[PDB]
């Protein structure tokens, strides 16, 4: 006679009105069951506050007019047809920026009761209120809000293909090799309503993810700690007014190097910044300050009575800063030497200064390094808590 | 029988001439109501002088031919049909650069009188004349001018869906997490005309936004304040003939260093610049002049190159100004040695008068560098007040 | 009866053959009037030698078939129809790189005689031979050459909607708030031809613009002037070698720091260089040569009087240019004098030393001349820029 | 009569139903033979973990309706027809990111029994789990998983055009002038089943490649080696800071500078570092600690008047290492005594120096060990790279 | 009666089967004459190894069905119709990356025998193996290979419109205001055959271009040459430890200031780099070493030189090296003579001087030698670039 698969298509698509919502009673809405499966997390631009992700999307609805009796058409039950030849809902995402990378699937499946199945990928670029308060130990929940732009709930309601529990624990396909880990895909339904006349169906998808901080645990924290811990020694083991300048220039050498390479690495939003960057500049600042101080006093007392103890108005301020922390010719010729190498007139003034002042920068550098070590474990715990 | 939507869709679109303006009297125009809702502010490139936005746009007009009696078609009043099957106006934005990200909504709603509704989003890239004069405390009104490119006022007028007051105080959806803040979306109608023959409709939308300057407040102002105050104790502690040079070149590095981290943070435009950068280099300018003038006095008079340095004609010209603002033969040889120990001991000349004039200028720049820091602090708060006023 | 617009569109588009050039005598061409209005200048990439602009474009031509009597259609004279339903010429810009930002206006107006007006925008990206020989004060003459790619003069000639004088002075819409300024849009017609058989029409629009130099005048020229004069006071009043060399090198650093912070915003193209960069490196070069000669003699002759009285040949040449520039007591006195022995010893060489030091003021004289030319060159650029 | 191609195309496309899968018994699937030919490797971003490539793709299937007896149509056996007029499978790649640079081929060949050969290029952008643990001597096998997005194995199975041996040894076209080298294209068939109801066909293509490490061998390894040896000789001869510290930190500058220059040379990812970057920071870190203890030694032994006496509980631990690792008259010369005392200087910490100075010799053993293993890895990396 | 174009366009396109190769005897091929005219070189990315160019393309073939007698249509011989209404071959460029910038021309010309003509532009982005060994004096031949993707030689052969001599030298349109100069566009026909069954046509176009090095010579060579010879003065005339440092310091600033500004300027490919980058780092490093070796000497000659008297084995080493290259009275005087010991430290330093001195007549010998080759290359590169 003729192939059933041609005998069926012409029976359906002929007298089919694409563009019309496929129902007989307009009062009845057509429902769309949704399924979302993550596949990858391509990029996270913390500056532009967006998220590039690749998911495997599918949905099904019902078409009253795409029905047939299989027994006539060689007992065929399923069928594939072009997607441009039938009605399709205007489902989208609210949180989108760019789209067009997602190709167009030119086919969909149909069953003899009107169930239409449409599979597709989605290269999405969404917006997300990202946070980098804890940069390496960062956790974020970005949302994908599926809905129809035009049709209301009286025409299009949205539901789920599967159970929610199957949607949360769905690691059946996901690239764990990337920077980010997947924890959950938590959905939620809502009846969106911005005004009175109309309401709209929404189906959210809270995409929770977690960073893999090990790379950053090494390249940042150990160098910072290895330098932070060693800058401490430059205050205590050696004396103020000494060659400890040699100890700090070399520290600052690698320290600035560390700041340079990492500034190329960690993000920099205008909305905020992480805390570890706050501790680096501090521990950089005091190093320069103590170094800028240490070079002065060796150079001040290097000379004898060249400038006498002029600024003795601030030693009053020093007073409780202590408390806060805690041959008759040959006669004169030979006497000219002990007169020469006596070093009390300017030294003692600016020396007691440098010592007591040194304990300040030391005692402060201790805590900036302390909090840097204290806060680090909390972010790990929170990162580990999830 | 058959269903209603099929009986209705064929009733309308059959013998429907898409491309024709949908009226019976051509003398009558076709108005289009408008509504705009700001969803987000995605990017503000102060260099290229553009703006990126996401808008939830809707409009409606009337189609005299898309009319029916609902009672025949099962009392159906509403309907959804494809957008490419009917006439649509050529509403566009003059202040546009890029389009293509905004997708196409294929469907539109229709009522039994002709009211066509078209909801859609708009990912826009507009051109806007910005100003970073008051860089952190910036406020900018960028305009969105909706109009038809071809059709005139006689064919297409433009109107508002809602009241203008509702449009301004519209924050039902907006991302307050982003860098910028929203204040108003002020509309305004105009009858644009550029020649004599034709006049065109316009409906503007002045989008007023405000920056969240807190992050920039600590990263640039506190450092700039930090460098400024310590430069000024550097004036009083050392007098001229001393270790000023110990401290100026110390801190001239700080301005030089700090001035780098702003050049990448601060948006590097070309039409203009903010005022803080002016105060940064102006404060650096004195930190050179106060340093250079200090060099020519101090290590010079100590060097004793000039035994008669003082110009009295010019020192007078200086002091004209300051007044307006304010064995026996061996028994001697030790004393001979002591003359050569006094050589080894110290030095002094008549340069103290010449050198006194070096002192007073340093204490005069104290009256200047202090001044520049003053206006830098005074100008700061009025910007905050303005930004706070909006 | 029935509406007129609906009754009319069937009268025209039915039996209408899109794709065919709309004339009755093929021997006659189809003229296309043109008009251009600038609206903004979006970007000028001196590196890639391109120009990004946004103009407002319109054109009209005559379609012999789109003709009707308005009396039979309710006295209606004008009509709007889609552009995809009619013939449209293949007008294009030759100096283009990328197009596609321009959206498509579907509708066009039609009159009862055949005039087919077509308004549209154009977001162009053209290729322009940009010159930054005079960077802050520069003027450019970029060309927008409109023509059909395929049809010849026998089918399509091109004219102007308006007069050229109106076109040049047209500034009804232009954003004067941007970086660049508009002066003129000069049109010009040509009969393009590259081989013998085929000739093609052309209408070039020479777009002249001008830069707003004030921002660059602040960021570059005053600091360069600022950093230049301090190298002059750092020469004369410190004739010494000790503090001179230090403060001179204190200057050469900030001289270099300024040299790079401008380099990021300075537009560097592989074709040519702006003159104000040429002056910075020359004044850097003399800042070094003056330093080289300075150290070449000082620590070798002055700080250590190593006996080098030999080179008077090397002063003969100098002497030319000076015309063309224009028992215990025995030991007590020993140690007592030994301190005086340890004082300075200005030998005859240190007198020879000073005749080489004379040229230190010659380089001063030359470095001064460089900074002078830096000023004379600037004003003539400002002047000619004012003339445009 | 009439042409054959014209008479033939009517015989087929008339009453043809594009969109229908071209078979008679739906129970039977339709197979798609596949072939892949590499042409170039264009870009490799280790940061974004993607890959850009250019391949020459072809495939064929069968169409039961596109059949004819060639004897009628002038013995014509082959034919070219457009792709838009016939059914086409929905074959794609799972590991895609962006596509659209690849153009569309508007023609397809067809034979007189249903074979439908479709050639096309593909400018792909694919994700790949890369690794730069062995940065210069790096190897990557990236996957190209071809499949249909919708249709199942029951409708569409996938097969190869050629044998896999032909596919692997296919360098008929490839640009060996690029940064990357090609080794193999290893295919593999699979049956994908994420769930129960449905199973899908797959045909992967493991694209194995190899870097050309020569340029990176020069710009990085020779300097790093050149920098490592020079810090070693600084540890043998000079025993104190005025002999040591002035030397080694001069290298710490260039060493640190070298660490900077490699970063902009290196590829920056976030999943894992190379190894050589570890040896650099380590040898840098070790260098710092040597510098650290060296200075504390100097302050107390060589500089101090009275120093921290010897606890020697720690020397008890350090010595265990060696077991494991191995009035006129005087008034005159009172001044001379003052001078003689001014010029002589010594303390007791020489004994306290010994326990400390040998730690220099101790850590010195490590700078060999690290710099040693720096080379040991670098050759097995070369070898395993060479073996591949 | 009726116009001719409407009477003609309906006579052809009615009963015209687009999608069919327009011939009567399928056994014949369909030739496609080709012509290529360069217009501009837009970009040359040495890093990504691509080439952005813009050409003016045209081709003509034969359509046996598009024929008419002009006498029956008002003696009309030519005609413009849409490209979308006729068969168009599948010509493409194999070595492309992305296309789509170029617009589509919706019209083509037709004559009364079948000679279809299709003018259009092309904004190409092709892959090319670019060498930058001779960076400023570069010469590069990139290939543009035109062919049909699907159709074979039996269906589509390719030829030229003009003679190759005309194509080889056609600067009738080209922008000589760019960085690159044009020399030749050499065509070449082949017959591609990757397998046994199918042979495909090809028409290559070797696009040979040349760089304009004048800008780079100023910005790179003269300063590098300038900062290559001033050091020689330091290397030669003063063996002094303090002065030579002060001189070598100043050069490092301008040299480092120079070395940065060139880095962004020149292209930094991964497969290779120009020779000019070699001598720079050499002349950079070798400056620091001399500056680094002097500071060792002065800091030890002055402070404490007799710690290590002189390592005689190293003395022997450098020795053979250059050899193969080539109670009151005198008690009062005792204190005075104590200062006569201050006249000059022990011979330990006089060898420690011989340590550092004799090097500088070698570091001089090598730096000058390195500067030699840097000058020798620059002229032979110029010669080749000039010969081309
Ligand atoms: N090739 C079918 C793979 C697959 C299984 N499940 C899916 C769900 C959605 C989708 O777009 C794709 C898929
Ligand atoms: N999904 C409909 C959300 C919505 C409510 N109001 C709107 C107005 C305009 C628009 O494009 C969209 C909307
Ligand atoms: N909305 C019409 C504005 C307008 C006035 N004149 C024009 C000329 C050309 C054009 O594309 C646009 C315009
Ligand atoms: N406007 C036609 C100019 C022209 C002359 N010759 C050509 C050859 C090819 C082409 O695309 C264009 C042209
Ligand atoms: N022009 C045909 C070249 C060629 C030979 N073999 C191929 C295989 C696939 C393909 O896309 C192209 C080709």
Author numbering:
A (entry chain C): 8 to 333, 403 to 462
B (entry chain D): 8 to 333, 399 to 462
C (entry chain E), D (entry chain B), E (entry chain A): 8 to 333, 401 to 462
Quoted passage from the original study:
Synaptic pLGICs play a central role in fast neuronal signalling, translating neurotransmitter release into an electrical signal by opening an ion channel gate depolarising the transmembrane potential. Five protein subunits are arranged in homo- or heteropentameric pseudo-symmetry around a central ion-conducting pore. Ligand binding at the subunit interfaces at the extracellular domain (ECD) is relayed to the 6-nm-distant transmembrane domain (TMD) comprised of four α-helices per subunit (M1–M4).
Ligand binding induces a 2.2° counter-clockwise rotation of the entire ECD around its own axis as viewed from the extracellular side, repositioning the loops at the ECD-TMD interface: the β1–β2 loop (via β2), the Cys loop (via loop B, β6, and β7), loop F (via loop C capping transmitted through β9, and via the rotamer switch of W168 on the complementary side), and pre-M1 (via loop C capping transmitted through β10). At the TMD, ligand-binding results in a clockwise rotation and translation for each subunit (viewed from the ECD along the pore axis), resulting in a larger pore diameter. The asymmetry of serotonin-5HT3R-Salipro was most pronounced at the TMD, with different conformations observed for the individual subunits. Taking a cross-section through the middle of the TMD at L260, two modes of rearrangements could be identified: (1) a major rotation and minor shift (chain A and C); and (2) minor rotation, but major shift (chain B, D and E). Additionally, sodium permeation events were observed during the simulations of the serotonin-5HT3R-Salipro form. Nevertheless, the observed minimal TMD pore diameter of 9.4 Å (at residue I267) for our static structure, and 7.2 ± 1.6 Å during the MD simulations, is in very good agreement with previous reports of minimal channel diameters of 7.6–10.7 Å based on permeability data for organic cations for 5HT3R expressed in mammalian cells.
